[PDB]
Amino acid sequence: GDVEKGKKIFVQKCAQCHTVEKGGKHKAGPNLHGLFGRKTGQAAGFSYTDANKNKGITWGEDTLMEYLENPKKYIPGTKMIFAGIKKKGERADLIAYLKKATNE
Ligand code: HEC
């Protein structure tokens, strides 16, 4: 994926609810630092839904690609309000950005 393009997608569609940086604040949604290789619902100090806590998958390219296409289909009852990103290339660019930003 294209990290520069992924950043712009993130700013447009995600940043109002999420931070990525180490020590970044929770906002409407959890800070995403450290997501890759972590099970759902594991950002410390955030009130997740039981739906998000209970999904039980491990975040990575494959599961993000699916989630981000249609978040509520993947995690019904999530409190994340975001309809999804249809395009595969856009999702891959976004995920590439997250893989960098959430591990710096
Ligand atoms: C607010 C209006 C949000 C927008 C826009 C996006 N997200 Fe979100 N996200 C939000 C909340 C409130 C939550 C918690 C949901 C719950 O049911 O408890 C989330 C959760 C996620 C997660 C899961 C985190 C985890 O399991 O630790 C991810 C991976 C995620 N959000 C990513 C994400 C991306 C990449 C976004 C733009 C495409 C995006 N979210 C938008 C709130 C909001």
CSV table of N, CA and C and ligand atoms in Angstrom, one decimal:
chain,number,residue,atom,x,y,z
A,1,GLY,N,0.8,-1.2,0.0
A,1,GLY,CA,0.0,0.0,0.0
A,1,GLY,C,0.9,1.3,0.0
A,2,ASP,N,0.2,2.4,-0.3
A,2,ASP,CA,0.9,3.7,-0.4
A,2,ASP,C,0.6,4.4,0.9
A,3,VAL,N,1.6,4.6,1.7
A,3,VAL,CA,1.5,5.2,3.0
A,3,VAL,C,1.1,6.6,3.0
A,4,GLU,N,1.6,7.4,2.0
A,4,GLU,CA,1.2,8.8,1.9
A,4,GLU,C,-0.3,8.9,1.5
A,5,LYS,N,-0.8,8.1,0.6
A,5,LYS,CA,-2.2,8.1,0.3
A,5,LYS,C,-3.1,7.6,1.5
A,6,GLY,N,-2.5,6.6,2.2
A,6,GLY,CA,-3.2,6.1,3.4
A,6,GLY,C,-3.4,7.1,4.4
A,7,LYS,N,-2.4,7.9,4.7
A,7,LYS,CA,-2.5,9.0,5.6
A,7,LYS,C,-3.6,10.0,5.3
A,8,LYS,N,-3.7,10.3,4.0
A,8,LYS,CA,-4.8,11.3,3.6
A,8,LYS,C,-6.2,10.7,3.8
A,9,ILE,N,-6.3,9.4,3.5
A,9,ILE,CA,-7.6,8.6,3.8
A,9,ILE,C,-7.9,8.7,5.3
A,10,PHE,N,-6.9,8.4,6.1
A,10,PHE,CA,-7.1,8.4,7.5
A,10,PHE,C,-7.6,9.7,8.0
A,11,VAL,N,-6.9,10.8,7.6
A,11,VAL,CA,-7.3,12.2,8.0
A,11,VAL,C,-8.7,12.5,7.6
A,12,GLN,N,-9.1,12.1,6.4
A,12,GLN,CA,-10.4,12.4,5.9
A,12,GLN,C,-11.6,11.6,6.6
A,13,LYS,N,-11.3,10.3,6.9
A,13,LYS,CA,-12.4,9.4,7.3
A,13,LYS,C,-12.3,8.8,8.7
A,14,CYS,N,-11.1,9.0,9.4
A,14,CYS,CA,-10.9,8.3,10.7
A,14,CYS,C,-10.4,9.3,11.8
A,15,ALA,N,-9.6,10.3,11.5
A,15,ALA,CA,-8.9,11.1,12.5
A,15,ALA,C,-9.8,11.8,13.4
A,16,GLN,N,-11.0,12.1,13.0
A,16,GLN,CA,-12.0,12.8,13.9
A,16,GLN,C,-12.3,12.0,15.1
A,17,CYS,N,-12.2,10.7,15.0
A,17,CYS,CA,-12.5,9.7,16.1
A,17,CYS,C,-11.3,9.0,16.7
A,18,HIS,N,-10.2,9.0,16.0
A,18,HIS,CA,-9.0,8.2,16.4
A,18,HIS,C,-7.7,8.9,16.3
A,19,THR,N,-6.8,8.7,17.2
A,19,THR,CA,-5.4,9.0,17.2
A,19,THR,C,-4.6,7.7,16.9
A,20,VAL,N,-3.4,7.9,16.4
A,20,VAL,CA,-2.5,6.7,16.1
A,20,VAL,C,-1.3,6.7,16.9
A,21,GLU,N,-0.8,7.8,17.4
A,21,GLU,CA,0.5,7.9,18.0
A,21,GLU,C,0.6,7.3,19.4
A,22,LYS,N,1.8,6.9,19.7
A,22,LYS,CA,2.1,6.4,21.1
A,22,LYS,C,1.7,7.5,22.1
A,23,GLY,N,0.9,7.1,23.0
A,23,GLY,CA,0.4,8.1,24.1
A,23,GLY,C,-0.7,9.0,23.6
A,24,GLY,N,-1.1,8.8,22.4
A,24,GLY,CA,-2.3,9.5,21.8
A,24,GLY,C,-3.5,9.3,22.6
A,25,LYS,N,-4.4,10.3,22.6
A,25,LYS,CA,-5.6,10.3,23.4
A,25,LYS,C,-6.6,9.4,22.8
A,26,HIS,N,-7.5,8.9,23.6
A,26,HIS,CA,-8.7,8.3,23.1
A,26,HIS,C,-9.6,9.5,22.8
A,27,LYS,N,-10.5,9.4,21.8
A,27,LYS,CA,-11.5,10.4,21.4
A,27,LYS,C,-12.8,9.6,21.4
A,28,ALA,N,-13.6,9.8,20.4
A,28,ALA,CA,-14.8,9.0,20.3
A,28,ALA,C,-14.4,7.5,20.3
A,29,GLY,N,-13.4,7.2,19.5
A,29,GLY,CA,-12.8,5.9,19.5
A,29,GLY,C,-11.4,5.8,20.1
A,30,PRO,N,-11.0,4.5,20.3
A,30,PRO,CA,-9.7,4.3,21.0
A,30,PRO,C,-8.5,4.8,20.2
A,31,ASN,N,-7.5,5.2,20.9
A,31,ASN,CA,-6.2,5.3,20.3
A,31,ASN,C,-5.8,4.0,19.7
A,32,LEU,N,-5.2,4.0,18.5
A,32,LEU,CA,-4.9,2.8,17.7
A,32,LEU,C,-3.5,2.3,17.8
A,33,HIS,N,-2.6,3.0,18.5
A,33,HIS,CA,-1.2,2.6,18.6
A,33,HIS,C,-1.1,1.2,19.1
A,34,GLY,N,-0.3,0.3,18.4
A,34,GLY,CA,-0.1,-1.0,18.8
A,34,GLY,C,-1.2,-2.0,18.4
A,35,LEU,N,-2.1,-1.6,17.6
A,35,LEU,CA,-3.2,-2.5,17.1
A,35,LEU,C,-2.7,-3.8,16.4
A,36,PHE,N,-1.7,-3.7,15.6
A,36,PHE,CA,-1.3,-4.9,14.8
A,36,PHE,C,-0.8,-6.0,15.6
A,37,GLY,N,-1.5,-7.2,15.5
A,37,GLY,CA,-1.2,-8.4,16.3
A,37,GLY,C,-1.9,-8.4,17.6
A,38,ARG,N,-2.7,-7.5,17.9
A,38,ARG,CA,-3.5,-7.4,19.1
A,38,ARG,C,-4.9,-7.9,18.8
A,39,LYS,N,-5.5,-8.5,19.8
A,39,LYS,CA,-6.9,-9.0,19.7
A,39,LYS,C,-7.8,-7.7,19.9
A,40,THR,N,-9.0,-7.9,19.4
A,40,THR,CA,-10.0,-6.8,19.5
A,40,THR,C,-10.2,-6.3,20.9
A,41,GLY,N,-10.4,-5.0,21.1
A,41,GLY,CA,-10.9,-4.5,22.3
A,41,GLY,C,-9.8,-4.4,23.4
A,42,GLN,N,-8.6,-4.2,23.0
A,42,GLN,CA,-7.5,-4.3,23.9
A,42,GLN,C,-6.6,-3.0,24.1
A,43,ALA,N,-7.1,-1.8,23.5
A,43,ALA,CA,-6.5,-0.5,23.9
A,43,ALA,C,-6.8,-0.2,25.3
A,44,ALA,N,-5.7,0.0,26.1
A,44,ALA,CA,-6.0,0.2,27.5
A,44,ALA,C,-6.7,1.5,27.8
A,45,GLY,N,-7.7,1.4,28.7
A,45,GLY,CA,-8.4,2.6,29.2
A,45,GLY,C,-9.5,3.1,28.4
A,46,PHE,N,-10.1,2.2,27.6
A,46,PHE,CA,-11.2,2.6,26.7
A,46,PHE,C,-12.4,1.7,26.9
A,47,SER,N,-13.6,2.3,27.1
A,47,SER,CA,-14.9,1.6,27.2
A,47,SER,C,-15.3,1.0,25.9
A,48,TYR,N,-14.9,-0.1,25.5
A,48,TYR,CA,-15.4,-0.8,24.3
A,48,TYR,C,-16.8,-1.4,24.5
A,49,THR,N,-17.6,-1.5,23.5
A,49,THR,CA,-18.8,-2.4,23.5
A,49,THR,C,-18.3,-3.8,23.8
A,50,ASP,N,-19.3,-4.6,24.4
A,50,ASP,CA,-19.1,-6.0,24.5
A,50,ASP,C,-18.9,-6.6,23.1
A,51,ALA,N,-19.6,-6.1,22.1
A,51,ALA,CA,-19.5,-6.6,20.7
A,51,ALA,C,-18.0,-6.5,20.2
A,52,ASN,N,-17.4,-5.4,20.4
A,52,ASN,CA,-16.0,-5.2,20.0
A,52,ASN,C,-15.1,-6.1,20.9
A,53,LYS,N,-15.3,-6.1,22.2
A,53,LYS,CA,-14.5,-6.9,23.1
A,53,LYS,C,-14.6,-8.4,22.7
A,54,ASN,N,-15.7,-8.8,22.3
A,54,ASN,CA,-16.0,-10.2,22.1
A,54,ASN,C,-15.7,-10.8,20.8
A,55,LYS,N,-15.4,-9.9,19.8
A,55,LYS,CA,-15.2,-10.4,18.5
A,55,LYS,C,-14.1,-11.4,18.4
A,56,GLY,N,-13.0,-11.1,19.1
A,56,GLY,CA,-11.9,-12.1,19.3
A,56,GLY,C,-11.0,-12.4,18.2
A,57,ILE,N,-11.0,-11.6,17.2
A,57,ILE,CA,-10.0,-11.7,16.1
A,57,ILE,C,-8.7,-11.0,16.4
A,58,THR,N,-7.7,-11.2,15.6
A,58,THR,CA,-6.4,-10.5,15.8
A,58,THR,C,-6.3,-9.5,14.6
A,59,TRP,N,-6.0,-8.3,15.0
A,59,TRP,CA,-5.9,-7.2,14.0
A,59,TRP,C,-4.7,-7.4,13.1
A,60,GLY,N,-4.9,-7.3,11.8
A,60,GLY,CA,-3.8,-7.3,10.8
A,60,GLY,C,-4.3,-7.0,9.5
A,61,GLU,N,-3.5,-7.2,8.5
A,61,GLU,CA,-4.0,-6.8,7.1
A,61,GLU,C,-5.3,-7.5,6.8
A,62,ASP,N,-5.4,-8.8,7.0
A,62,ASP,CA,-6.5,-9.6,6.5
A,62,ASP,C,-7.8,-9.1,7.2
A,63,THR,N,-7.7,-9.0,8.6
A,63,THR,CA,-8.9,-8.7,9.3
A,63,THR,C,-9.3,-7.2,9.2
A,64,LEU,N,-8.3,-6.3,9.1
A,64,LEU,CA,-8.6,-4.9,8.7
A,64,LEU,C,-9.2,-4.7,7.4
A,65,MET,N,-8.8,-5.5,6.4
A,65,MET,CA,-9.3,-5.4,5.1
A,65,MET,C,-10.8,-5.7,5.1
A,66,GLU,N,-11.2,-6.7,5.8
A,66,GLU,CA,-12.6,-7.1,6.0
A,66,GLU,C,-13.4,-6.1,6.8
A,67,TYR,N,-12.9,-5.8,8.0
A,67,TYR,CA,-13.6,-4.8,8.9
A,67,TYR,C,-13.9,-3.5,8.2
A,68,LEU,N,-12.8,-3.0,7.6
A,68,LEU,CA,-13.0,-1.6,7.1
A,68,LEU,C,-13.9,-1.5,5.9
A,69,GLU,N,-14.1,-2.7,5.2
A,69,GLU,CA,-15.1,-2.7,4.1
A,69,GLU,C,-16.5,-2.4,4.6
A,70,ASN,N,-16.8,-2.9,5.8
A,70,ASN,CA,-18.2,-2.8,6.4
A,70,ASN,C,-18.1,-3.1,7.9
A,71,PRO,N,-17.8,-2.1,8.7
A,71,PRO,CA,-17.4,-2.4,10.1
A,71,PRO,C,-18.6,-3.1,10.9
A,72,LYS,N,-19.8,-2.6,10.7
A,72,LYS,CA,-20.9,-3.2,11.5
A,72,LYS,C,-21.3,-4.6,11.0
A,73,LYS,N,-21.0,-4.9,9.8
A,73,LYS,CA,-21.2,-6.3,9.3
A,73,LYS,C,-20.3,-7.3,10.1
A,74,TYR,N,-19.0,-6.8,10.3
A,74,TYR,CA,-18.0,-7.6,10.9
A,74,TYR,C,-18.2,-7.6,12.4
A,75,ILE,N,-18.6,-6.5,13.0
A,75,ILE,CA,-18.8,-6.4,14.4
A,75,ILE,C,-20.2,-5.8,14.7
A,76,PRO,N,-21.2,-6.6,14.6
A,76,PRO,CA,-22.6,-6.0,14.8
A,76,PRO,C,-22.7,-5.5,16.2
A,77,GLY,N,-23.3,-4.3,16.3
A,77,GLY,CA,-23.5,-3.7,17.5
A,77,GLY,C,-22.3,-2.8,17.9
A,78,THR,N,-21.2,-2.7,17.1
A,78,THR,CA,-20.2,-1.8,17.4
A,78,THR,C,-20.7,-0.4,17.5
A,79,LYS,N,-20.1,0.4,18.3
A,79,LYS,CA,-20.5,1.8,18.5
A,79,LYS,C,-19.6,2.7,17.5
A,80,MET,N,-18.8,2.1,16.7
A,80,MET,CA,-18.1,2.8,15.7
A,80,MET,C,-19.1,3.1,14.6
A,81,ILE,N,-19.3,4.4,14.3
A,81,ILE,CA,-20.2,4.8,13.2
A,81,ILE,C,-19.4,5.3,12.0
A,82,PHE,N,-19.3,4.3,11.1
A,82,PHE,CA,-18.5,4.5,9.9
A,82,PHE,C,-19.0,3.4,8.9
A,83,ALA,N,-19.5,3.8,7.7
A,83,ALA,CA,-20.2,2.8,6.9
A,83,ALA,C,-19.2,1.9,6.2
A,84,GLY,N,-18.0,2.2,6.0
A,84,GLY,CA,-17.0,1.4,5.3
A,84,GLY,C,-16.3,2.1,4.1
A,85,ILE,N,-15.2,1.5,3.7
A,85,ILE,CA,-14.6,1.9,2.4
A,85,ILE,C,-14.7,0.8,1.5
A,86,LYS,N,-15.4,1.0,0.4
A,86,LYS,CA,-15.6,0.0,-0.6
A,86,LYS,C,-14.4,-0.5,-1.4
A,87,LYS,N,-13.6,0.5,-1.7
A,87,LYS,CA,-12.5,0.1,-2.6
A,87,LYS,C,-11.3,-0.6,-1.9
A,88,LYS,N,-10.8,-1.7,-2.6
A,88,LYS,CA,-9.8,-2.5,-2.1
A,88,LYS,C,-8.5,-1.7,-2.0
A,89,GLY,N,-8.1,-1.0,-3.1
A,89,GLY,CA,-6.9,-0.1,-3.1
A,89,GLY,C,-6.9,0.9,-2.0
A,90,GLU,N,-8.0,1.6,-1.8
A,90,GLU,CA,-8.1,2.6,-0.7
A,90,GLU,C,-7.9,1.9,0.6
A,91,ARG,N,-8.5,0.8,0.9
A,91,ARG,CA,-8.3,0.1,2.1
A,91,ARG,C,-6.9,-0.4,2.3
A,92,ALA,N,-6.3,-0.9,1.3
A,92,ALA,CA,-4.8,-1.3,1.4
A,92,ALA,C,-3.9,-0.1,1.7
A,93,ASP,N,-4.2,1.0,1.1
A,93,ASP,CA,-3.3,2.2,1.3
A,93,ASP,C,-3.5,2.7,2.8
A,94,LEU,N,-4.8,2.7,3.2
A,94,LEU,CA,-5.0,3.1,4.6
A,94,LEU,C,-4.4,2.1,5.6
A,95,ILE,N,-4.5,0.8,5.4
A,95,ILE,CA,-3.9,-0.2,6.2
A,95,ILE,C,-2.3,-0.1,6.2
A,96,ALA,N,-1.7,0.2,5.1
A,96,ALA,CA,-0.3,0.4,5.0
A,96,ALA,C,0.1,1.6,5.9
A,97,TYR,N,-0.7,2.7,5.9
A,97,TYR,CA,-0.4,3.8,6.7
A,97,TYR,C,-0.6,3.4,8.2
A,98,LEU,N,-1.6,2.7,8.5
A,98,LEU,CA,-1.8,2.3,9.9
A,98,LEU,C,-0.7,1.4,10.4
A,99,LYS,N,-0.2,0.5,9.5
A,99,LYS,CA,0.9,-0.4,9.9
A,99,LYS,C,2.1,0.5,10.3
A,100,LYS,N,2.4,1.5,9.6
A,100,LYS,CA,3.5,2.4,9.9
A,100,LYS,C,3.2,3.2,11.2
A,101,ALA,N,2.1,4.0,11.2
A,101,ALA,CA,1.8,5.0,12.2
A,101,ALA,C,1.6,4.4,13.5
A,102,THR,N,0.9,3.2,13.5
A,102,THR,CA,0.6,2.6,14.8
A,102,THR,C,1.7,1.8,15.4
A,103,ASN,N,2.9,1.8,14.8
A,103,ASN,CA,4.1,1.1,15.3
A,103,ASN,C,5.3,1.9,15.4
A,104,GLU,N,5.2,3.2,15.2
A,104,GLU,CA,6.3,4.2,15.4
A,104,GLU,C,6.5,4.4,16.9
B,1,HEC,C1,-16.3,7.9,14.9
B,1,HEC,C2,-17.4,8.5,14.4
B,1,HEC,C3,-15.5,6.9,14.3
B,1,HEC,C4,-15.0,6.9,13.0
B,1,HEC,C5,-15.3,7.9,11.9
B,1,HEC,C6,-14.2,5.7,12.8
B,1,HEC,N1,-14.1,5.1,14.1
B,1,HEC,FE1,-13.0,3.4,14.5
B,1,HEC,N2,-13.9,3.3,16.2
B,1,HEC,C7,-14.7,4.2,16.7
B,1,HEC,C8,-15.2,3.6,18.0
B,1,HEC,C9,-16.2,4.4,18.9
B,1,HEC,C10,-14.7,2.4,18.2
B,1,HEC,C11,-15.0,1.5,19.4
B,1,HEC,C12,-16.1,0.6,19.0
B,1,HEC,C13,-16.8,-0.3,20.0
B,1,HEC,O1,-17.7,-1.0,19.6
B,1,HEC,O2,-16.3,-0.4,21.2
B,1,HEC,C14,-13.8,2.2,17.1
B,1,HEC,C15,-13.1,1.0,16.9
B,1,HEC,C16,-12.2,0.9,15.9
B,1,HEC,C17,-11.3,-0.2,15.8
B,1,HEC,C18,-11.2,-1.4,16.7
B,1,HEC,C19,-10.2,-1.2,17.8
B,1,HEC,C20,-9.9,-2.3,18.7
B,1,HEC,O3,-10.5,-3.4,18.5
B,1,HEC,O4,-9.1,-2.1,19.6
B,1,HEC,C21,-10.5,0.0,14.6
B,1,HEC,C22,-9.5,-0.9,14.1
B,1,HEC,C23,-11.0,1.2,14.1
B,1,HEC,N3,-12.0,1.8,14.8
B,1,HEC,C24,-10.4,1.9,13.0
B,1,HEC,C25,-11.0,2.9,12.3
B,1,HEC,C26,-10.5,3.4,11.0
B,1,HEC,C27,-9.3,2.9,10.4
B,1,HEC,C28,-11.4,4.4,10.6
B,1,HEC,C29,-11.5,5.2,9.4
B,1,HEC,C30,-11.6,4.3,8.3
B,1,HEC,C31,-12.4,4.5,11.7
B,1,HEC,N4,-12.1,3.6,12.7
B,1,HEC,C32,-13.4,5.4,11.7
B,1,HEC,C33,-15.2,5.4,16.3
B,1,HEC,C34,-14.9,5.8,15.0
